[PDB]
Design a protein around this motif. Structure first.
Motif, short mmCIF file in Angstrom:
data_model
loop_
_atom_site.label_atom_id
_atom_site.label_comp_id
_atom_site.label_asym_id
_atom_site.label_seq_id
_atom_site.Cartn_x
_atom_site.Cartn_y
_atom_site.Cartn_z
N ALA A 1 1.86 1.30 -12.57
CA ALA A 1 0.47 0.89 -12.51
C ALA A 1 0.09 0.58 -11.06
O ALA A 1 0.95 0.23 -10.27
CB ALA A 1 0.23 -0.32 -13.42
N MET A 2 -1.18 0.74 -10.71
CA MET A 2 -1.62 0.56 -9.32
C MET A 2 -1.68 -0.91 -8.86
O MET A 2 -1.05 -1.29 -7.87
CB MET A 2 -3.02 1.16 -9.13
CG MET A 2 -3.01 2.68 -9.11
SD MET A 2 -2.40 3.34 -7.56
CE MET A 2 -3.84 3.10 -6.50
N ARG A 3 -2.45 -1.72 -9.59
CA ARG A 3 -2.75 -3.07 -9.09
C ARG A 3 -2.93 -4.16 -10.14
O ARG A 3 -3.40 -5.25 -9.76
CB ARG A 3 -3.93 -3.05 -8.07
CG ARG A 3 -5.19 -2.50 -8.63
CD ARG A 3 -6.27 -2.51 -7.56
NE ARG A 3 -6.85 -3.83 -7.46
CZ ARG A 3 -7.85 -4.14 -6.64
NH1 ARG A 3 -8.38 -3.24 -5.81
NH2 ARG A 3 -8.34 -5.38 -6.65
N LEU B 1 1.58 7.39 -6.63
CA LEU B 1 0.64 8.46 -6.89
C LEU B 1 1.23 9.82 -6.49
O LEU B 1 0.99 10.81 -7.16
CB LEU B 1 -0.69 8.21 -6.16
CG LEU B 1 -1.44 7.00 -6.71
CD1 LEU B 1 -2.49 6.50 -5.70
CD2 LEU B 1 -2.12 7.37 -8.02
N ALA C 1 0.82 -1.21 0.00
CA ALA C 1 0.00 0.00 0.00
C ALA C 1 0.85 1.25 0.00
O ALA C 1 0.55 2.22 -0.70
CB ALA C 1 -0.95 -0.01 1.20
N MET D 1 2.08 1.98 -3.49
CA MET D 1 1.01 2.56 -4.29
C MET D 1 0.88 4.05 -4.00
O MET D 1 0.76 4.85 -4.92
CB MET D 1 -0.32 1.84 -4.04
CG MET D 1 -0.30 0.40 -4.51
SD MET D 1 -1.61 -0.58 -3.75
CE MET D 1 -3.04 -0.02 -4.63
N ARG D 2 0.86 4.40 -2.72
CA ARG D 2 0.77 5.80 -2.34
C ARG D 2 1.96 6.61 -2.91
O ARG D 2 1.78 7.72 -3.42
CB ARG D 2 0.66 5.92 -0.82
CG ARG D 2 -0.66 5.36 -0.29
CD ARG D 2 -0.72 5.30 1.23
NE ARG D 2 -0.89 6.64 1.75
CZ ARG D 2 -1.91 7.08 2.50
NH1 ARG D 2 -2.86 6.26 2.94
NH2 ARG D 2 -1.91 8.35 2.88
#
Lengths: 375, 374
Positions: A276-278, A177, A170, A173-174
C-alpha cells in the motif's frame, strides 16, 4: 503574528505534507515562518515565506536560536546532531519533531492532542519544551481506539499490522510502484488474451517477482505481490523496533506507567509491510476489563474525537469504507469489524485504517503549533 | 492398478494443480483414471489417461457410479447436484472433494493427513466414504501450528489473515494483476524521471485507483495498493463466512467437539484480502494452557510434519523466508515470528505463510487417494 517559527525538513515528503496542511489551515497567517535548508542556504525561500525570503542554514546554531519554535521533519540523524548543540548554546524555545529520537526522554512529551491534550497542557505548565510526534502505528491506533483507553476499559491489546510503503520513505513508494510494473509487464499480453492459462500467468509473475529485473534495492525483497513480516531494527530478542514502539509509546502518550509495570497497558503484536502507498491498517485483538455491550462500545469509539468514525460491521460497508483506497489523503480514521470474539464478551476484534502521512506524521505537529499559539 | 478413479473439474485452476501434482508423483501409474467433462463428453481425454481415452459425462449418474473413487474440484454447486443423486442410487464409493458443501456433514471427514491421519484412518475403519478438503486458511494454519494442537496446549487463538487472490479464483488473480498495471501505468513516466515529485506520483496513483478505468468487477473494490477486510458471505452478526470456518473446521479436523461445545478450542479472527497471487499468510495471537519454553514450542512445531519449517525469529531470515515470494508454488509451510507476548509467558505470537493451491486445495486430495491405495 510575530511568533518566529523555523521549519526544517520542509522539502522532504513529510515536510511537504506539513506545508500543504499549514497552507490549507491558514497557519502561515499566524506566524513569521523561517525556512531552513540543508543545502542552498542563501537561496530564495518558498512562496509561504513573508518577511524571511531567504533560506537559512539548517545546521547553523545561531540562526536556529533566533526561533521561538522549530518544527522539524528532517529526521533523527538531524535531531541527534543539532538538538544537543542548540540546547547547549542556551536555546529555550519549543522543539516540535516527527523523529523518534527524543520520544522517550523524561523532558519530552509525545503529542497526539485529540487523545492526550491534558498530558500536553500539564507539561506546558510544568515547563516542558520538547513535543514529539509518536510512531505512526501508535498515533493511528489511538486516533481510532482512544475512547476505550479514555474510559479505562482496556486490559491488553495485540495489533497485527498491514503497513504502507510511505513509512519507509518516498524511494520505497517508488519501488513498490515499479515492482507492480514488473509483475504486470511479465503478463500484459496474457492478461489481454481471454484464452490464456492462469497457471502460465502465475508462473510468469513468480519468475518476474524473483528474477533479476525486480527492483528490490529499497526493501531488500519484493513487496508488490508479497509482504514483509519485519519492520525496523532487529532488537535481538524476536521483537522488531516497530513492535516495541507500540507498548512504549502507547503508555507514555496516555501518561501511564512504563510498559511492564503495574498500571500500564500491554500493547504488543507483529508489524508487517504490505503493498500500500500511504495508509496503515491494523487488526486488533482487544481484551476489555468487562463485558461492555457492543452498542456502547460503538458510541465510546465514535464520540472520542472529530476524526474517528465507526464503520458498520457489514460486508459492503467494510469493503468500501475500511481500506487504503477510501482513506488515503484524508484525515478520517475509520474503525470497524467490531464484534465479540469467541473467547467471551470481554474479547473484542477491531480493524482500523489511517493515513500515515497525516495523523501518522504531519498533523500532530501543526496542531501542536496551534496549541502554542492558543489558536 | 485397477482402482477406477473419476476426475471431475480437472481443467479448472485447482484441478490443474491437482493434475500436475498427480503426474509429478506417479499417481496415474497406480490407478485407472476416468476423466469427466461438463461440456465435452465423448471428446478426447487428456493424454495421461490410460485405457479410458474418451471423456465421460460429469452429470451421468450411470458413468459416475462405475467409479471406485471420485475426486472432484468442480465446486459446491456440482457436488450439491450429483452427490445426493449418486448416493441415493446406492453408490458406495469414496468421494474426495475440495468444496465446502459436505465438510460439516456427520458422515464426512475433513482431511489434512499430516495433521489428522488418525482421524482419517479411524473413519475408514468405521465405514466413512466422504473425505473433504478443508478451507485453505485452516489447512494452512494447521500445517504450521498443528503440533501445539496435537499436544493439547492451545487454550484459544486469534488469526488475522493476509489472503491471496487465488482463493477467489482465476479471474480474481487476473484482476489483481490488471490493477497493478493501472496503478503503475498512471505514473510510469514519473517513475522513470528521478526528479519527479512523490506527492504528484501519490496523487496520480490514488486517482487511478479510484477512477472508472480501474478494473474492479471481480473484487468489487481495489485490491492492488489496498486491502479488503471481508471475505465471503456476511453472516449478519459481524462475522464473515471465512472467519466462521476457522473455529468450525479446526475443531472438526482435529476430532474435537464442535465449535462452541465443551472441549472445543476457540479459533476466531478477521480475514483480510491483500494483493498476493496464491499464498495466504496469517498473524496469530495464541494463548497456551501453560507457560511452555520457546525452545520446546519450536521443537513441537518443527517435529509435527515433513513440510512445516520454523524460521528463526530474526530480521534477515524473516524477510527472506517468511513471505509469498519464497513460498509460492512450493509445499513448504514456514512459521516464524514466534515469541512470548507482553501479557505473559502463556501468550505466543506466530506468523505463517502457505501456498493456497497446494496444501490449501489440491494436495490433501491426492494424498487421500494414496491413503485409499495404501
Amino acid at each position: 503574528g510575530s511568533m518566529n517559527v523555523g521549519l526544517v525538513g520542509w522539502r522532504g515528503m513529510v515536510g511537504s505534507v506539513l506545508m500543504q496542511r499549514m497552507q490549507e489551515e491558514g497557519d502561515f497567517d499566524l506566524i513569521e515562518p523561517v525556512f531552513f535548508s540543508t543545502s542552498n542556504a542563501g537561496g530564495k525561500a518558498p512562496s509561504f515565506a513573508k518577511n524571511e525570503t531567504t533560506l537559512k542554514d539548517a545546521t547553523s546554531i545561531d540562526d536556529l536560536k533566533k526561533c521561538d519554535v522549530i518544527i522539524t521533519c528532517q529526521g533523527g540523524d538531524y535531531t541527534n546532531d543539532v538538538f544537543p548543540k542548540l540546547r547547549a548554546a542556551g536555546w529555550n524555545g519549543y522543539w516540535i519533531d516527527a523523529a523518534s529520537s527524543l520520544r522517550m526522554k523524561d523532558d519530552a512529551v509525545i503529542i497526539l492532542d485529540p487523545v492526550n491534550l491534558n498530558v500536553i497542557k500539564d507539561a506546558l505548565v510544568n515547563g516542558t519544551k520538547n513535543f514529539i510526534g509518536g510512531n505512526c502505528t501508535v498515533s493511528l491506533m489511538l486516533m481510532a481506539l482512544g475512547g476505550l483507553f479514555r474510559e479505562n476499559l482496556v486490559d491488553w491489546m495485540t495489533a497485527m499490522t498491514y503497513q504502507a510503503a510511505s513509512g519507509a520513505g518516498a524511494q520505497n513508494m517508488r519501488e513498490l510502484l515499479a515492482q507492480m510494473g514488473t509483475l504486470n509487464g511479465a503478463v500484459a499480453a496474457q492478461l489481454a488474451d481471454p484464452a490464456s492459462a492462469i497457471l502460465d500467468i502465475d508462473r510468469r509473475v513468480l519468475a518476474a517477482m524473483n528474477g533479476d529485473a525486480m527492483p528490490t534495492s529499497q526493501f531488500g525483497v519484493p513487496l508488490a505481490g508479497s509482504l514483509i513480516p519485519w519492520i525496523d531494527k532487529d532488537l535481538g530478542n524476536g521483537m522488531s523496533r516497530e513492535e516495541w514502539k507500540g507498548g512504549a509509546e502507547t503508555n507514555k502518550i496516555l501518561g501511564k506507567p512504563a510498559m511492564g509495570e503495574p498500571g500500564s497497558v500491554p500493547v504488543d503484536g507483529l508489524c508487517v509491510r504490505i503493498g500500500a502507498m500511504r495508509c496503515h491498517s491494523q487488526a486488533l485483538t482487544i481484551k476489555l476489563k468487562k463485558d461492555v455491550p457492543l452498542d456502547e462500545i460503538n458510541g465510546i469509539l465514535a464520540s472520542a474525537n472529530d476524526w474517528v468514525k465507526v464503520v458498520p460491521n457489514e460486508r459492503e460497508a467494510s469493503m468500501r469504507d475500511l481500506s487504503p483506497a477510501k482513506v488515503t489523503g484524508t484525515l478520517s480514521v475509520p474503525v470497524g469489524r467490531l464484534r465479540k470474539l469467541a473467547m467471551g464478551g470481554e474479547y473484542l476484534s477491531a480493524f482500523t485504517v489511517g493515513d500515515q502521512l497525516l495523523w501518522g506524521a504531519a498533523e500532530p505537529l501543526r496542531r501542536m503549533l496551534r496549541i502554542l499559539l492558543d489558536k
